[PDB]
Design an enzyme around this catalytic site. Sequence first.
Site, PDB file in Angstrom:
ATOM      1  N   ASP A   1       0.838  -1.207   0.000  1.00  0.00           N
ATOM      2  CA  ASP A   1       0.000   0.000   0.000  1.00  0.00           C
ATOM      3  C   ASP A   1       0.875   1.261   0.000  1.00  0.00           C
ATOM      4  O   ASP A   1       1.999   1.226   0.485  1.00  0.00           O
ATOM      5  CB  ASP A   1      -0.866  -0.026   1.263  1.00  0.00           C
ATOM      6  CG  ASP A   1      -2.126   0.837   1.161  1.00  0.00           C
ATOM      7  OD1 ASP A   1      -2.351   1.517   0.133  1.00  0.00           O
ATOM      8  OD2 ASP A   1      -2.898   0.826   2.144  1.00  0.00           O
TER       9      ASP A   1
ATOM     10  N   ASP B   1     -11.029   1.890  -2.562  1.00  0.00           N
ATOM     11  CA  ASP B   1     -11.419   1.747  -1.156  1.00  0.00           C
ATOM     12  C   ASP B   1     -12.927   1.768  -0.987  1.00  0.00           C
ATOM     13  O   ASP B   1     -13.458   1.375   0.056  1.00  0.00           O
ATOM     14  CB  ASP B   1     -10.782   2.837  -0.294  1.00  0.00           C
ATOM     15  CG  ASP B   1      -9.358   2.511   0.082  1.00  0.00           C
ATOM     16  OD1 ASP B   1      -9.006   1.317   0.051  1.00  0.00           O
ATOM     17  OD2 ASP B   1      -8.598   3.441   0.414  1.00  0.00           O
TER      18      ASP B   1
END
EC number: 3.2.1.22
Lengths: 723, 723
Positions: free
Chosen positions: B474, B544
Site C-alpha cells: 500500500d 477503497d
Amino acid sequence: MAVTYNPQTKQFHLRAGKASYVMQLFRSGYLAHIYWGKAVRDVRGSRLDRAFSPNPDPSDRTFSLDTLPQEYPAYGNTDFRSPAYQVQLENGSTVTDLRYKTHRIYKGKPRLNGLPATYVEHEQEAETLEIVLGDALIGLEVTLQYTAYEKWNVITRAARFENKGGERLKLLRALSMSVDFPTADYDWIHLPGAWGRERWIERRPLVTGVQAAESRRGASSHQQNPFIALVAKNADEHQGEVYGFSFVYSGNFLAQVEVDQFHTARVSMGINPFDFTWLLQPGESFQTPEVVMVYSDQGLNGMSQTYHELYRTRLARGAFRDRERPILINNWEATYFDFNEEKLVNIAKTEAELGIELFVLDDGWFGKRDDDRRSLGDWIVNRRKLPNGLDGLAKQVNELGMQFGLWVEPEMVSPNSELYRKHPDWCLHVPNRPRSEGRNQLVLDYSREDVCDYIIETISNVLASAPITYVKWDMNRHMTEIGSSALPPERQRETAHRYMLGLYRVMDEMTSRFPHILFESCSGGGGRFDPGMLYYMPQTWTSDNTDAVSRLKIQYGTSLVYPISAMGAHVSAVPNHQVGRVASLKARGHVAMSGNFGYELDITKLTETEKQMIKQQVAFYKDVRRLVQFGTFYRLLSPFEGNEAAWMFVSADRSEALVAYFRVLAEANAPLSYLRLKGLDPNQDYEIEGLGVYGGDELMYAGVALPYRSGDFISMMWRLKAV
Amino acid sequence: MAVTYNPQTKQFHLRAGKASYVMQLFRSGYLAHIYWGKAVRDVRGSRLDRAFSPNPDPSDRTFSLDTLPQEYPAYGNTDFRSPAYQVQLENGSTVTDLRYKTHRIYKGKPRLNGLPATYVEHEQEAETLEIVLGDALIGLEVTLQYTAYEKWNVITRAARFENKGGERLKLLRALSMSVDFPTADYDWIHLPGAWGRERWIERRPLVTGVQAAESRRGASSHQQNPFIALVAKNADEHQGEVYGFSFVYSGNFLAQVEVDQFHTARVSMGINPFDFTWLLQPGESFQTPEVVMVYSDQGLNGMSQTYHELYRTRLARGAFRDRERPILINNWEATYFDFNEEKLVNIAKTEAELGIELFVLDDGWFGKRDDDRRSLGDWIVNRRKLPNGLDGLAKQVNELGMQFGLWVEPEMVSPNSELYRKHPDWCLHVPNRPRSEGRNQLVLDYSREDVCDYIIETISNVLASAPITYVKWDMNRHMTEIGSSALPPERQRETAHRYMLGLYRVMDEMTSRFPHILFESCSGGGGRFDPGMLYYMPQTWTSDNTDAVSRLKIQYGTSLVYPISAMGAHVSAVPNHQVGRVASLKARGHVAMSGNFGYELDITKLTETEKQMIKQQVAFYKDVRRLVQFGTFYRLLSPFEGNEAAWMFVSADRSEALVAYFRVLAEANAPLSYLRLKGLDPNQDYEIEGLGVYGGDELMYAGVALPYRSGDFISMMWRLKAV
C-alpha cells in the site's frame, strides 16, 4: 382584461396581465391569428401565395387557407393542415366555410353550459370577446369565446356550435382552440406517465409533422396529462418564453402540435376526436370545454405560478378554496378490509394525540365489499361491520378532536351487486359484446339521467347520515365497450362525453348538497388530476406511489400546472410497495410536507420514537402549512435533469420561505453542492434555521453551501424568516 | 508484427494484428506520420504551405514543421504546436533539430532500462523498429522505439535520448510519443476520478486548443488514470474506430490532445514535463517509459479486449500470471488495530469453513503502529501483539487450509519512528521548508540507493520469516516538497522520476526474492492502478469504495483498460462507509464476483444465514472464477449512460458465459427491460440457469427478457452453457 376591437385595422387586441393576444379580420371574413406574447401597444397584422396551396377565392390568388394563420381552421376548402373542427353534412360532404359575422365584447367571464371553467368574482377581473362565425349555406354558427384576465397572463378559449339550419349536422371534431405560431423554433413539453408514476416532464424538439399527447380512456388519464407547452429553445425554470395550454376537462382529450412545410406551428387542444361525434339537430348547440392559455417570459416557474394562482383562487371553489387543508390519515393499511368499530376509536385517540386532524375511513364499509371484487354500486352501510352505522363512529372520532372522512367510488358497479342484478343495462356497454372488466368491475353509464339521479340519491343518503366533513371520491378503471342503451345509433359516439357531462352534473350536485365536506378526487391516484376535476373537488390524490424518490418526479411534474394546495402527498410505511425502497421517516416527511400533507399507514405498528417523529412532523407542517399550500412555489433543481430535486415556497410579502433539497445516490467523496434560491427580497436579511443569517441577495446570487453529506437519499428542509 | 521499410518510398509500415501504422521520411531527414488504422496493403504518403507557418528550409517553401504531421516534433524551428520533447543547451537556447540518421528492424521486443514494459515470450510474437534521429550540432541522439505485435492490434512506443556531444543537455520535456492525426473528428475519452470513485469514463468532443489529463502527484493517481482514447463520433462499445493510449508508468504523467488551426489532432503522452527536468552529461542517456497504442474498429470492447489479453499475459509477470487468484478475506474491520493472536486462529477456522482461501493480516502488526500516526518505516514485528511472531500465526492458518497474507506500506515513514530519528534526511524534502504530511506520514526518498537497500533488507527480513504467500503493498499519500539531499541543485527536478525508478527497482527485487508471493499493489485503493504497477504486481486493489452501486462505475471504467484478473473487488459490510448505502448481500456479491473476488468484513458479526450466503458465494465464484478472471469481457450497458450496468464473460471456445445485470432506482410499474448479449456462437444453443434454453442468435439479436422487478437496486447473474 382590456379587450378592444379596432374598426380601422379590423384587429382584436386582448390584453391579459402582461401579455398580448392579437387577431385580425382578413379579406372576406377570415379570422387570422396575428400575435401572442409579451404585451405590446400595437402590432401590425407575407407570401401567403405558395406552390400547391390553392386559392379559396378564384378572383384573389394572394392567399390560401393552407398558409393563412388562423384561430379556428377547417379542412377541405384549401387548408391542408390539421383542422380545429370538422362537420359532416347529410349529403356526406365534410366541407364547411365559416366566415366572420359579428362580435361582442363584455366585462366578466361567462359560465359554460354543463362544464367547469375558470371564473371571476368581479366583472373587473376579466373581459370576454365572442366572435360569431357562420356558414350561411348550412346554417352552422360557431362562436369563438375568448377571455382575458386583468391580473394574470391568461387567455381562455372555447367554441360554441349551433345548428341554425334545417338539416342535421354531425360534428366529427370539435376542438376547444387552435393557434398558428409564425415559427416552430420551440421545444414542446408534455406530461406523460403511468399509474404510480404520473406526470413526468418530457421536453422534446418539434418535428415537421404532428406530435401529440392524448387520452382515449374516457378519463384524462395517468398516461398523458391534458397539458402541453411550447417553450423557447433556451427557456428554463427561471427565464424565457413559455406558452402553456391546459384543458379544463376530465375525459378524452387531444393536445397536438402540427408543424407544416413552412415551419409554422399549429397548436390545438380539445375533446379527442377519436371515437367521438356529436349530432346537432336543427336548433341544437354544442359547447366545448375551455383551454387555459398562459404566457410567461419568466420561464416555467413564471407560467406555473400563474396557473397556481388562477386555479387555486378562480377555478377551485367551495368553502375550502382558500382554507388550510387538514392533515389527514387514511386508515386502510391498518386493516386492508379487516375492520370493525372497536379498533377504530382507540386508533383515533392515538392519531389525535399526535396532532393529526382528520380521520379517514377507507374501502369496504359498504354492502358485501371485501376485496376488489364486490358490492360496488350498493352504497348502504354494511351494518354488521358498523352496527352503530357511520354516525356512532363519526361522533366518537369528533369527540376525540378529529374530523371524520369517507371513501366512495360511485362510478363503478360490481357484476355481483344488487344494482347490477336489477339494472344490468345501467353500465356502459355495446349490444351483444362481452363486458370487459377492470379490477372486477364495470363502469356505470353516467350519460343516463336515471343513473345519475340514483347516485345522487344514494350517496346523499350516506353522506347526510353522519357528521362527515371529508370525502375521497375514487374511480379505479377506464372505459371499454363505450355505449349506452339509452342513446340511438346516431348518438352512440357521444357516450364518453355525455358520461363526463353526467359526472360533472353529479359532482356539482354533491358538492353543493354537502358544503361542509372537503372533497378530494382520486383515480388510482392521479389518473384524473386535471383542471376539470379541480373545479368540483379542490384537491386530488396525486399518485398511489408514495415512495419518496418516486414522488420527487411526480410532484415536480404535477406542480408544472397544479397548485400545491391541490396536490395530496402522504407519508406511508416502508418496505415501499410499488417500487421497493427504504428512505428515512424524515425523508418521506420532507417530500410529503412539500405537498398537501397527510398519512397513509398503520399507526398500530409504529415505535414510540417514530410516533414521536410524526408528532414533530405534524407540528412542523402546521407551522409551514399556509406557506406550503398558499405561498408562491419555485422549482429550483429538476429530478428530470439529474440526481437532485429542489424547490421552495415564499410568502406573499417575501418575509418567510421554506426551502427543500433532495439528492439520490450521492457518491463518496463528492464535490461540494450549492443551492441558489429565488423569490426573496435581495435587500432583506434572512435567518435560516440551523444555518445562520444570510442576505436575500447572497442566497439567490451566490447560493447556500449545502452541508456536505453522502448516502442513498439526502433530504433537507429549512425555514427562512426575515430578520 | 511484420515491420518493413521500403527504400523506394522511404516508408515504414508496421503491421500489428489487423492494424497498420505507417511513417515516411520526408525531404532532408524529417520523419512524417502517415497513417494509423485498419490494416492496408499500402498507403501513399497537401498544402503544407500555410500563412504564418514558416519554412525551415529557405530554399524550399513547400512546407513547415507547423504543418507536417510528425512522430516526434520539436518546438522552435517552425513548428508552433505542442512539442514531444524540449532540450535546453548551455547557451540557454532551446532550439534542437533532430533529423533521421538511420534505423534498424529486429524480431522480438527489447527490455527498457530501469522500467516496466510489455514483453514477448518468443521473438515471433513481435518485431521492433528503432529509428535513430540526431542533431549533429549538439550531439543529441534520440532513438524512437516502435514495436508491433503479431497477434494484437498493438503498437508500443518509447524514445531514448543520448548525449553524444561534449556539452550538458537539459531535457525539459521528454514525452514517450506523439502522433498527428489528419483530422480531429473524434471524441476523446479519459478516466478522471477521486479517492473512492476512481476511473469514471468521461467522453467529450475535442476543442480547438489543448485538452489533457495529468498527474502532478508523483503517482499516476486517483484523480486521472494514465489512459486516453480518441473515438469516432458514432463509436460505442460494439462498433467503430477507437485509438487507445495507455502509459506504462506509475508516476507523474501528461496525456494530451492538441488540435491546431487546421483541425489536425496531436496526441501525446509521457512523463509530465511539469516540475520535471533531466540533465544529460556527455555520454549519458535517458529512456522514456512506453505508451501502448491500440486500434480497434470493433468499438470500446474491441480495444479493451486487446489491452486485457496483452496486459494479463504479456505485461503482468511471475508465477501467478496465468493462475486463478485466491478468494481472500481482509481481517481489518474485525479489529481495526485492536489485535492479538488468540482471536485470529478461530476466525481463520470460521473463514476456512466457508471455503475462503486466503487469510490476510492488515495494518498495525509492526512496531508501535496503532493508528494512522506511528511507526511506519520500522518494519519489525511488534512481538507483544504477536509474541510467537508471524510464523506461529501463519503456520496455524496454513494447517487450517488457508494461505496467509500480509499488508505493508514501505514507501512511508512516520516522523515518530526510529528510522526518522536516525535518518531524517531519508525523506523527500527541500532545504529549510516545512515537511507537509499526508495521514501523519512522510514519503521516503526512493531516489536514494541507501533508502532502497534498507527497504529491500527490512521487508525481506519480514517476508522470509513466515510462510507468507500474499502481500498487499500500500502507499497512502502523494508527494509534497519534492527533493532529495542526495542530488545536486541541477538534478533536483529529477527527484520524482528517480523516486519511481527506485520503487521499480525495489519492487522488481522484492517480487523476485519472493516468487511464492502473490503481490497486490494498493494506493488508498486504485491510486496507482496503471500498467507500470501491473508489471510488478499482477493485481491491484481497485478502490477503497466497496459500495455496490459505486463499484458499478469504478469497475466499468477500470475495465476499459485493465484485465479483470487484476481488478480486486470485495464484499464488505453495511452501513457502507464512503457513501452510506444498503444493498443486499446478494447484490454486493454480484458486483464483487465480477472482479477478482474477496471479502473485507468482520466474520464475527455475521448471522448464520449470512455466512450461509457467503459459503454459497464462495462456491459459486470458484465455479466461475476461470471464466471471470480469464474469459473475454464484454461491457453491455453503461452506468455512465443511465441507471443500468451490464457485462458478461465468455470462455475462449464460447461454450460458457457468465452474464451480470444491474439497475438502480427501478421505478414502479416500469417498462419491461431487455438485455442483448455479445460474444456467443449464434448457431449454438445455450442453457441459462433458471431461464431455459436460448439460441446464441436469439440472445444476441433479440436479447433476454429480464424478469420484471422493481426496487432500489436490482442485481442478477446467470451462468450460460452450450447445450
